[PDB]
Amino acid sequence: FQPTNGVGYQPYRVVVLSFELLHAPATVCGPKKSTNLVKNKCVNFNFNG
């Protein structure tokens, strides 16, 4: 790789991420988009499933 060169001849760092979709172990998960609490009114609740 040379500093003054075409981008085709310039470095690209590649970080290949492999993710299998069975998800039975589920070792890595997203934040899961927790909302806020709105008590004192009838609401459809879903605390932790």
């Binding site: 039975a24 172990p25 589920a26 070792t27």
Partner: protein
């Protein structure tokens, strides 16, 4: 799913299995999904 449940208890005996009641609370749940039909233990030995 592999479930390992653990508890600790102080005792004051020389050789027995203590009587009484003790509930073993959960510790960890490994989601491994492999067949297990054989198990073994691992000790430690002293040397000098």
């Amino acid at each position: 799913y592999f479930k390992i449940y653990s508890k600790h208890t102080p005792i004051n005996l020389v050789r027995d299995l203590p009587q009484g009641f003790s509930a073993l609370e959960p510790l960890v749940d490994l989601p491994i999904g492999i067949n297990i039909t054989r198990f073994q233990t691992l000790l430690a030995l002293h040397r000098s």
